[PDB]
């Protein structure tokens, strides 16, 4: 039709559909972006399953991407038509109680993690464009820019207080765990211990710069092994990158005196916190939703080629083949699979 675009929409628990929808338009004076490349997040799989029921039926999925500005409102000053830009997963009005703190995850004025229609479509309405878009450096690859990584860094690495010479364990060697692994190396920890059940993912973790792998198939033997690597003291940081009670439980068994369990993942159930044992251990437990306030610092730390996040990307698809992209991602272990999805539909 006319004025329409293609988009991947959530329908109901167990059903998403590549369909025609209206092209978005400017609704407020603070942009419309043409998506160039996007990806899928584990949370998108959860939405389709029905485990994020605040996602209304018909919503366009996805909250990761780069694109090209097509139109801006009267109140947009630092971006114009034609600008190649990165879109953060979090919208920030820049003025409210939480934006003034840099906690864009909890912006109170059409803010936070809302990608409203998301990025698995041809065009995207971006609220608060001046605070949600970033000009992209020409030195970085598209695959690395779509990864902008801030989840692993802000929620796994910074809240965990990784520092040179400390001992880190990362629980869960899927995409968010690997992203935390890459950015934890900005702080040169002595030990980066990847813990997982799958040996293929652990082998990839060593490729990405983990110093040791521990297979959690025998939990007791893994706990022993981690205490053996830390001279009986346990780790200074345990990054929980899976989001189930078992991984949270593992983290609380290996954390040492003064250490931090940094939770990254969504949890769908409450967990049993062993305060009877840990009240005396001087430990911390942190949570958070990414804000992306560090995106400028990560851009700087990537143009220098400290780490190369483009190695998170393993499979390439066209937007019109987004159904296939979901099939590969949801069965990532079968394919040794992050995917990148390129807009093969839109014209300039």
In terms of C-beta density within 10 A (0-12 exposed, 13-18 middle, 19 or more buried), how is residue 19 classed?
middle
Tokens of 22: 């209206």
| Window of 11-19, 36-44, 240-248, 310-318 that interacts with Zn ion by CB under 5 A | 36-44
In the bound state with a second copy, the residue whose beta carbon lies nearer, of 173 and 263, is 263
Query: CB 291 → a second copy: shortest distance, Å?
Result: 8
Distances in whole angstroms, Cα of residue 294 to Cα of each of 86, 155, 193, 325:
14, 11, 25, 29
Site size for a second copy, by CB under 8 A?
38
- Phi, psi for 42 (deg, rounded to 5): -55, -35
Interaction of residue 43 with Zn ion, rule CB under 5 A: yes
Interaction of residue 39 with Zn ion, rule CB under 5 A: no
Query: CB 58 → Zn ion: shortest distance, Å?
Result: 20
3-state secondary structure of 246: helix
**Residue choice 215, 286, 320, 330 for contact with a second copy (CB under 8 A):** 286
**Residue choice 74, 138, 220, 276 for contact with a second copy (CB under 8 A):** 276
Query: CB 50 → a second copy: shortest distance, Å?
Result: 15
Q: Give yes or no for a contact between 10 and 48, defined as CB atoms under 8 angstroms apart.
A: yes
**Residue choice 19, 55, 68, 278 for contact with a second copy (CB under 8 A):** 278
Give pairs for 114-117: CB < 8 Å, separation 24+. Answer: 115/62, 115/63, 115/87, 115/89, 115/91, 116/59, 117/7, 117/21, 117/24, 117/59, 117/60
In the bound state with a second copy, the residue whose beta carbon lies nearer, of 22 and 258, is 258
| Window of 30-38, 87-95, 201-209, 247-255 that interacts with Zn ion by CB under 5 A | 87-95
In the bound state with a second copy, the residue whose beta carbon lies nearer, of 54 and 304, is 54
**Residue choice 74, 138, 220, 272 for contact with a second copy (CB under 8 A):** 272
Q: Give yes or no for a contact between 159 and 239, defined as CB atoms under 8 angstroms apart.
A: no
- Phi, psi for 73 (deg, rounded to 5): -80, 170
Q: How many CB atoms lie within 10 A of CB 75?
A: 11
Binding site residues, a second copy, CB under 8 A: 97-98, 101, 103, 105-106, 159, 233, 243, 248, 257-258, 263, 265-289
């Amino acid at each position: 039709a006319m004025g329409s675009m293609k988009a991947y929409t959530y329908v109901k628990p167990g059903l998403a559909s590549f369909v025609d929808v209206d092209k978005p338009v400017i609704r407020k004076p603070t942009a419309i972006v043409r998506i160039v490349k996007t990806t899928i997040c584990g949370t998108d799989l959860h939405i389709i399953k029905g485990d994020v029921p605040t996602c209304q039926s018909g919503t366009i999925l996805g909250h990761e991407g780069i694109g090209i500005v097509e139109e801006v409102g009267e109140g947009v000053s630092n971006f114009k038509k034609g600008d190649k830009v990165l879109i953060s997963c979090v919208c920030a009005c820049g003025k409210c109680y939480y934006c003034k703190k840099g906690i864009y995850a909890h912006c109170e004025d059409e803010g936070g993690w809302i990608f409203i229609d998301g990025m698995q479509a041809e065009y995207l309405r971006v609220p608060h464009a001046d605070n949600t878009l970033y000009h992209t450096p020409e030195d970085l690859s598209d695959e690395a820019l779509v990864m902008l990584l801030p989840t692993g860094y802000e929620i796994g690495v910074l809240k965990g207080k990784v520092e040179p010479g400390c001992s880190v364990a990362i629980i869960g060697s899927g995409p968010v765990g690997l992203a935390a692994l890459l950015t934890a190396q900005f702080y040169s920890p002595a030990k980066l211990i990847m813990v997982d059940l799958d040996d293929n993912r652990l082998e990839t973790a060593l490729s990405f710069g983990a110093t040791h792998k521990v297979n959690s198939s025998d939990p007791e033997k893994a706990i022993k092994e981690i205490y053996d690597l830390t001279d009986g003291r346990g780790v200074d940081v345990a990054i929980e990158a899976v989001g189930i009670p078992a991984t949270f439980d593992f983290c609380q068994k290996i954390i040492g005196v003064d250490g931090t369990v940094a939770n990254c993942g969504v949890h769908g159930k409450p967990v049993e916190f062993d305060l009877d044992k840990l009240w005396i251990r001087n430990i911390n437990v942190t949570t958070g939703l990414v804000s992306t306030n560090t995106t400028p610092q990560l851009l700087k730390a990537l143009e220098s080629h400290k780490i190369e996040p483009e190695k998170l990307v393993t499979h390439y698809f066209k937007l019109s083949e987004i159904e296939k992209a979901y099939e590969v991602f949801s069965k990532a272990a079968d394919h040794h699979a992050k995917v990148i999805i390129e807009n093969d539909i839109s014209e300039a």
